[PDB]
Design a protein around this ligand. Structure first.
Ligand SMILES: CC(=O)O[C@H]1C(=O)[C@@]2(C)[C@H]([C@H](OC(=O)c3ccccc3)[C@]3(O)C[C@H](OC(=O)[C@H](O)[C@@H](NC(=O)c4ccccc4)c4ccccc4)C(C)=C1C3(C)C)[C@]1(OC(C)=O)CO[C@@H]1C[C@@H]2O
Ligand SMILES: CCCCCCCCCCCCC[C@@H](CCCCCCCCC)CCCCCCCCCCC
Ligand SMILES: CCCCCCCCCCCCC[C@@H](CCCCCCCCC)CCCCCCCCCCC
Ligand SMILES: Nc1ncnc2c1ncn2[C@@H]1O[C@H](COP(=O)(O)OP(=O)(O)OP(=O)(O)O)[C@@H](O)[C@H]1O
Length: 1158
């Protein structure tokens, strides 16, 4: 379990106004949450007074009273609307502002801490993790401290307010609904579990066939070489039959379970309202109280569930922020920002190392230094020589205060480096690295990085002394030319000379050189060397380099070995001692996817039309019942709004409740029918699409496969996951569209039948709510995209900084980098403030229009009832039939798996299916001559790989072999041997030239007919997850193979001497799940599989390159008989294995260099 930091440390950076924002936003969120159940209370009381005035009606004085007091209730609604408007605006705006400020401070402090850390801490964490953290986990913190906390508080406030308003009216109904609530919770949990697990269970069911699919797409070469498509396709089809069976069972079980859960919650609602009606008949409650309690408690209980995503967001926010807080709190051993320490002056430049012991913290168990003791006087030149990894780089890093030594001390002019502060020490010492890194900025700012207060004239003087004066003038924009990867790629020496200019502009007292000219060509090496030896004068320098010519003129050329100093002398002394230096001297000297339209996708499933017809006819009746639910609800509510004897009221109330239950039962059975039929249609669609796409993939040649855009993983994703969503485009899409259409139509029509004015007003005030919702979603998406695109600018600076941590630390420019990051953060800060304000406004308007809509609609309804245009029951009918219809439309649309993913999947699926290969495998259009002979010839054969068309893989190849003659094709891996094997198998058609079979080109022959006559054994013998008998029978596919042929093939391959050793001989299973076999045995079974077909031409491709000698002898024994009487092609990396070969051809980038005999 990942640790968390909790409240005491999560908020942390919050000064004054931040906590004020937090508290005000929380209070506003509480008000906003508590508003809604109060609006329900007003609804209940207004309904009660409407019924009271109606039964008073059931003369104009109390009608005027109705007008005025309903106007007062409209005022109540408008006041609630204004209050929730201001509360929502305040909550969203203040929480977003507080989160933005807090996260801005967090980002600044986190970058500052990362720049503060010592190199040692940086070396135990990879570079790639830090930037990905700084982006993603900071975004997660933004999610955690954003509006989510406000929404969580609003949800809890709704829960508590609903329960409180329920309990203050009547405890009986609240207790009944609360005791029913566990049933609703359990049913919702079941629905969530079954709905979520559906895809994972689908994957689990498919895994069986997916294993075979993955196996085939990894050995495509052999499959197409042996012509096994017409058998592996059928195996895949059988596994798909099994998958289809299990998927059908899963679909029916899941559908019936979901139907049962929905019927359960529906009956729970029905029972609760029936008990409410029974209480009403007893005279203890009124309609208003029952409506208020029921709706309030239900909405509170539903709202308490809405807080779960907020809780999860908070939890992952803490989990992400724990690492950041740990990193920032980590005080390093050496603090570059520390002002403490000595501040020396007039530094002469002497250096002293005494007993210096040091090891890398990453590899502490390995010791690098063994007590260095080095004396350097100011003024002269001291160089260090030695082998790679002998502490030279470690010595340089320790010199400039990067790693403190384990034991011993280093002093400058007799003063310890520990006493001196890090900043001044690093500023004094100048260092030149082996591989300079240049920032993506103009040369002017690159030089400016050396020091802040350097004048332009000083820059010019430094460049003149750095020999870069001449070359810079040739640049298009002189000293302001943009350089780096985006700028023109400068020469290798240009980077080195501008780096030495950057070092020299600081005018350092002590200079360090780490392989200055190691990675430079000689022409620029001479220039940079003369620059180095001109700049070396007047300063004390330490130089380490592999080339001894540069350090030949050094005053003291000290040797280095095993982290200790043994030999110390000059050129003459070193060359007279005949030590390590003398030996070194003597040895050196997505994309454009065209949409395919709904009609084509529907055509992909035209054959199963009866399933679609019954599904649509079931979806019509399923959808059209939500308005019926509304009608029955309004009728039962209005039952008590008329004056009659109690017994008739009880009778018809029970009748309506029973009708409600019966309609629920009908809904359950229709939902089961529709779900089952659509699921079966979709599964048949998926099975047929998988079969056809696998057929098409097996039909096309390898030119498709070699493309790296679509690898084995991509293809198996297409087969497994991509094709499973096609049923989202047709089927379920038709279901949701039809359901929504019927739900809107029935409600609109019945409302028009009952009352046209009120339904007109609703048809005018509901679309604006929907358009407000969609506008809010569009604004949110645009805001997120703009935020990411703007923050990419600061991310670029962050990446440029972190990846060059060594150089930026060495150049003590961390302050400048932080300052540059400051403004790049500052602009998005203002953008975030503006986005917070606009989001507050739009969310306030979205969440407020409902109350004003209620007020206006019910005012219009009251006016209508005032003059007996309609009845209150009709008002409730035309209100419910529209509002519940809209909510149901939204929810049903949410239920379905949208449409965009299905569309983008169907585009790929159709483009793959319709893709006709250049060389059609299944086509019978091809010449069928008699038995083949073996006169293979090549003329001017030219071919280019799809991956590397520019690289010459085949250019004018011309080789010849005759009947019954052994030829060899030796060469480096992938130099043409694979290409000629593939083209003989007809895997790649050469761009130019003719490959003649029996003196005639291989173009006019049918693919299977020509491929059936060749024998291919590759370097890695790939075997399939089946039996040994099946594997050997795979060798030929034109006819079945009996047991005796297998026996004689094994005897010829000599594997039979080992097959009997197996417990189950021929019946032994082979593969990963079976018994493991060695390389020699696998090669023997592979050559047996080659021989069983008995081709008259066979090719070997580096097969004997991975065989142990004991098994190699038996393999050669079998191959000596195999090659006798047959034409053989030999490819191998061993000269001994090709000694018996007669003819050899050597490939040179596809150009024949030497062909003929061995
Ligand atoms: C008077 C009236 O119509 O009231 C509504 C209703 O009040 C609300 C709250 C309903 C109601 O649903 C819930 O209470 C509910 C709660 C949690 C999870 C799922 C449902 C309703 O029960 C559910 C019912 O919805 C449906 O019938 C859907 O089409 C849904 N139904 C069933 O699955 C079902 C099957 C057999 C028996 C009863 C229902 C459906 C969803 C997807 C695919 C096919 C069908 C409706 C609109 C109502 C009630 C009755 C209160 C909601 O249901 C839907 C999906 O329409 C919840 O979200 C909507 C919003 C509606 O306003
Ligand atoms: C660190 C702590 C920062 C300040 C506290 C914050 C925490 C969230 C808000 C709590 C304050 C209001 C609590 C609700 C009570 C309102 C009636
Ligand atoms: C497509 C499906 C459309 C379904 C529409 C259903 C509409 C219903 C309307 C019912 C109106 C009241 C009649 C219910 C029974 C009343 C019995 C009174 C004694
Ligand atoms: N971060 C590190 N972790 C572990 N060992 C390291 C690390 N950095 C350097 N070393 C060690 O230092 C040596 C490599 O040093 P570096 O790459 O700077 O060049 P070098 O060996 O001095 O010479 P050259 O110029 O030929 O590369 C190796 O012995 C290596 O084990």
């Amino acid at each position: 379990k990942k640790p968390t930091v909790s409240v005491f440390s999560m908020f942390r950076y919050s000064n004054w106004l931040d906590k004020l924002y937090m508290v005000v936003g929380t209070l506003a969120a509480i008000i906003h949450g508590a508003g809604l159940p109060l609006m329900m209370l007003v609804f209940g009381e207004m309904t009660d007074i409407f019924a009271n005035a109606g039964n008073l009606e059931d003369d104009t004085g109390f009608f005027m009273n109705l007008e005025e007091d309903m106007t007062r209730y409209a005022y109540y609604y408008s006041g609630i609307g204004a209050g929730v408007l201001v509360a929502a605006y305040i909550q969203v705006s203040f929480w977003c502002l507080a989160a933005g400020r807090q996260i801005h401070k967090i980002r600044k402090q986190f970058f500052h801490a990362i720049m503060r850390q010592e190199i040692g801490w940086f070396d135990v964490h990879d570079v790639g993790e830090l930037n990905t953290r700084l982006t993603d986990d900071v975004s997660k913190i933004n999610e955690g401290i954003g509006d989510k906390i406000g929404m969580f508080f609003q949800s809890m406030a709704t829960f508590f307010t609903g329960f409180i308003v329920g309990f203050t009216r009547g405890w009986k109904l609240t207790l009944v609904i609360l005791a029913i609530s566990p049933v609703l919770g359990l049913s919702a949990a079941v629905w969530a579990k079954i709905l979520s697990s559906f895809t994972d269970k689908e994957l689990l069911a498919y895994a069986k066939a997916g294993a075979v699919a993955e196996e085939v797409l990894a050995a495509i070469r052999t499959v197409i070489a042996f012509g096994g498509q017409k058998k592996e396709l059928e195996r895949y089809n059988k596994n798909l039959e099994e998958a289809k069976r299990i998927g059908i069972k899963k679909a029916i079980t899941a559908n019936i379970s979901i139907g049962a859960a929905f019927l359960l919650i529906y009956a729970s609602y029905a029972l609760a309202f029936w008990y409410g009606t029974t209480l009403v008949l007893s005279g203890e409650y009124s309609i208003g109280q029952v409506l208020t309690v029921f709706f309030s408690v239900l909405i509170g209980a539903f709202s308490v569930g809405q807080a779960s995503p907020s809780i999860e967001a908070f939890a992952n926010a803490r989990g992400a922020a724990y690492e950041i807080f740990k990193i920032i709190d980590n005080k390093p051993s050496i603090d570059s920002y520390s002002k403490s320490g000595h501040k020396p002056d007039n530094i002469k430049g002497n250096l002293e190392f005494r007993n210096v012991h040091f090891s890398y913290p990453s590899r502490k168990e390995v010791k690098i230094l063994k007590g260095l003791n080095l004396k350097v006087q100011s003024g002269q030149t001291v160089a260090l020589v030695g082998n790679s990894g002998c502490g030279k780089s470690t010595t340089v890093q320790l010199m400039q205060r990067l790693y403190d030594p384990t034991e011993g001390m280093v002093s400058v002019d007799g003063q310890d480096i520990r006493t001196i502060n890090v900043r001044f020490l690093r500023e004094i010492i100048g260092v030149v690295s082996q591989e300079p890194v240049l920032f993506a900025t103009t040369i002017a700012e690159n030089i400016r990085y050396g020091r802040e207060n350097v004048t332009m004239d000083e820059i010019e003087k430094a460049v003149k002394e750095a020999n870069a004066y001449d070359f810079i003038m040739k640049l298009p924009h002189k000293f302001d030319t943009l350089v780096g990867e985006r700028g023109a790629q400068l020469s290798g020496g240009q980077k080195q000379r501008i780096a030495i200019a950057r070092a020299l502009v600081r005018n350092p007292k002590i200079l360090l050189l780490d392989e200055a000219t190691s990675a430079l060509d000689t022409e620029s090496e001479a220039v940079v060397q003369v620059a180095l030896d001109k700049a070396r004068k007047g300063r004390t320098t330490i130089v380490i380099a592999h080339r001894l010519s540069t350090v030949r003129n050094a005053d003291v050329i000290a040797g280095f070995d095993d982290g200790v100093i043994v030999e110390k002398g000059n050129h003459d002394e070193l060359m007279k001692e005949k030590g390590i230096y003398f030996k070194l001297v003597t040895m050196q000297t997505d994309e454009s996817i065209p949409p395919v339209s709904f009609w084509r996708i529907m055509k992909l499933n035209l054959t199963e039309w009866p399933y679609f017809v019954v599904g649509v006819f079931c979806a019509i009746i399923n959808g059209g019942l939500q308005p019926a639910f509304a009608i029955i609800f309004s009728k039962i509510i209005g039952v008590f709004t008329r004056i009659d004897d109690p017994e008739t009221k009880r009778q018809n109330s029970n009748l309506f409740s029973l009708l409600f239950l019966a309609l629920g039962i009908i809904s359950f059975i229709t939902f089961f029918l529709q779900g089952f039929t659509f699921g079966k249609a979709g599964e048949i669609l998926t099975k047929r699409l998988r079969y056809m796409v696998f057929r098409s993939m097996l039909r096309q040649d390898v030119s498709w496969f070699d493309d790296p855009k679509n690898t084995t993983g991509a293809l198996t994703t297409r087969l497994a996951n991509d094709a499973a969503q096609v049923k989202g485009a047709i089927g379920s899409r038709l279901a949701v569209i039809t359901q929504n259409i019927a739900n809107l139509g029935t409600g609109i029509i019945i409302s028009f039948i009952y009352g046209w004015q009120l339904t007109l007003l609703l048809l005018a005030i509901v679309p604006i709510i929907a358009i407000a919702g969609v506008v809010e979603m569009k604004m949110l998406s645009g805001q997120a995209l703009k935020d990411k695109k703007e923050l990419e600018g600061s991310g670029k600076i962050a990446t440029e900084a972190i990846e060059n941590f060594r150089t930026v630390v060495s150049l003590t420019q961390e302050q400048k980098f932080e300052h540059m990051y400051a403004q790049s953060l500052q602009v998005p800060y203002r953008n975030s403030l503006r986005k917070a304000h606009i989001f507050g406004i739009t969310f306030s308007f979205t969440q407020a229009m409902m109350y004003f809509s209620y007020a206006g609609c019910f005012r219009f309804g009251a006016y209508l009832v005032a003059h007996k245009l309609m009845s209150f029951e009709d008002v409730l009918l035309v209100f419910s039939a529209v509002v519940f219809g809209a909510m149901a439309v939204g929810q049903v649309s949410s239920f379905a798996p949208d449409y965009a993913k299905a569309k983008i999947s169907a585009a790929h699926i159709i483009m793959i299916i319709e893709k006709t290969p250049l060389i059609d495998s299944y086509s019978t259009e091809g010449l069928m001559p008699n038995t083949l002979e073996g006169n293979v010839t090549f003329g001017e054969v030219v071919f280019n790989y799809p991956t590397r068309p520019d690289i010459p893989v085949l250019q004018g190849l011309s080789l010849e072999v005759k009947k019954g003659q052994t030829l060899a094709l030796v060469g480096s891996s992938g130099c043409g041997k694979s290409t000629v094997v593939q083209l003989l198998e007809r895997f790649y058609d050469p761009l130019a030239g003719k490959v003649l079979l029996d003196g005639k080109e291989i173009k006019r022959l049918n693919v299977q007919w020509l491929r059936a006559h060749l024998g291919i054994v590759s370097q890695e013998p790939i075997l399939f997850d089946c039996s040994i008998a099946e594997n050997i029978a795979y060798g030929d596919n034109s006819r079945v193979v009996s047991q005796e042929e297998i026996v004689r093939a094994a005897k010829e391959a000599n594997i039979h001497a080992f097959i009997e050793s197996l417990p189950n001989k021929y019946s032994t299973k082979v593969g990963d799940k079976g018994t493991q076999l060695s390389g020699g045995q696998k090669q023997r079974i592979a050559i047996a599989r080659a021989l069983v077909r008995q081709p008259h031409i066979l090719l070997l491709d580096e097969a004997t390159s991975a065989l142990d000698t004991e098994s190699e002898k038996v393999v050669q024994e079998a191959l000596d008989k195999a090659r006798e009487g047959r034409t053989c092609i030999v490819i191998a990396h061993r000269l001994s294995t090709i000694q018996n070969a007669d003819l050899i051809v050597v490939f040179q980038n596809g150009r024949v260099k030497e062909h003929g005999t061995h």
